[PDB]
């Protein structure tokens, strides 16, 4: 169970958590012997795992080629990866906890990971907005700035990190021109 959860956080759907090209990772409805409440909690986590899978595919798609193009687009992909890094760290901590107590319950994981259920959706919404509007170059900076006025402190800090990377790029281009 716990190992398969860590796998889903690693992006590889399993038999209980299956990958759908449309939905990402999701809990199989057919897995017997789980109490429906457990299935519900698993599916709530699997929504995060699905978003993680889609985010990883996007990051690879827009960084992995060494159409939208630009140093700002590359910075966006790097920002997304750096925002998933804290999720990776939390997954490593969960892995250590499950290695320490194999009897640990899913409720512990769900509590420890609930903050990511809120952090990830807001950044995914902003990224998808940039994608859908085909924001290019410094217009990505404009979009991120507009999104920075948001009320979510965790989201604010993450977007500040993204903005800092983009400002480092803007400042490099400004230095070259000026």
């Amino acid at each position: 169970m716990i190992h398969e959860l860590l796998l889903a956080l690693s992006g590889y759907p399993g038999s209980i958590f299956t990958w759908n090209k449309r939905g990402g990772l999701q809990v199989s409805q057919d897995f017997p012997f789980l109490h429906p409440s457990e299935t519900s909690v698993l599916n709530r986590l699997c929504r995060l795992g699905t978003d993680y899978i889609r985010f990883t595919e996007f990051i690879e798609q827009y960084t992995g080629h060494v159409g939208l193009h630009g140093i700002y687009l590359r910075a966006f992909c790097t920002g997304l990866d750096s925002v998933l890094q804290p999720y990776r760290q939390a997954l490593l901590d969960l892995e250590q906890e499950f290695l320490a107590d194999p009897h640990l319950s899913i409720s512990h994981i769900n509590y420890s990971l609930d903050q990511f259920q809120l952090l990830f959706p807001s950044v995914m919404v902003v990224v998808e907005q940039i994608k859908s509007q085909k924001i290019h170059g410094c217009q990505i900076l404009e979009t991120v700035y507009k999104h920075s006025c948001g009320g979510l402190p965790p989201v604010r800090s993450a977007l500040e990190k993204i903005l800092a990377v983009c400002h480092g790029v803007m400042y490099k281009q400004l230095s070259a021109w000026m």
Partner: protein
Amino acid sequence: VLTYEASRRRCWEQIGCPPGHREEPYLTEAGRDAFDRFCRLRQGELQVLGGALLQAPQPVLVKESELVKDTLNVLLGVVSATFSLCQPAQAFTVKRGVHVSGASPESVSSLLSEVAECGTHYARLSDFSLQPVLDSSCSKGLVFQAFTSGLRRYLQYYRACVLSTPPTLSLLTIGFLFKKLGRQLRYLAELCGVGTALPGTGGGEPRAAFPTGVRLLSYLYQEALDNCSNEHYPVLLSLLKTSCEPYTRFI
């Protein structure tokens, strides 16, 4: 003989003296034996409906630290005892055996395998860039020798970092720690020779346009401008410097 211990759990189901045995806890509140057993059982159901089309490529193996050792060897460039470099590690093609995990038969091998394919590519790429001189489109060229030697240097540093940082680390930690290195390696594998789903940079076969020698001193300048978007800015700068060192010598 008085010294025996007894249960401190007293339940509300037996109003005599209950034994204390619970209800066979739920699958998700305990694993490592029931996890693997439930996974194997679900895969058994699927194999029954499929006609036994899994055949457990490595149903279980090796352990934690021994599987980690094999994976670290594969990442160093010596294929693991279940993994060949640029070759399927396991004879299972379902995502339980190509599986970040599921506790399913083969899934223990699979958590390694999913990250392993990148490590096999890394190994073949490190062989490609390991010697500074090579036949055909890679012979002659001092800038090419410098480039290949520095790449072999970084491949060696990567291989020594693996199986020296994560001795006896679970697959998940190994993969998480090495993801940020293997992605840069895969980008350079697309940039460089075999060890990738694109042989060299350009094409995906042993006829790639990747230059060498003075042709490489050309090639690299456009490859450097055209892409540096993962982690190559310091590395590409050093590579351009060393590639120009033979050019700068000649000039």
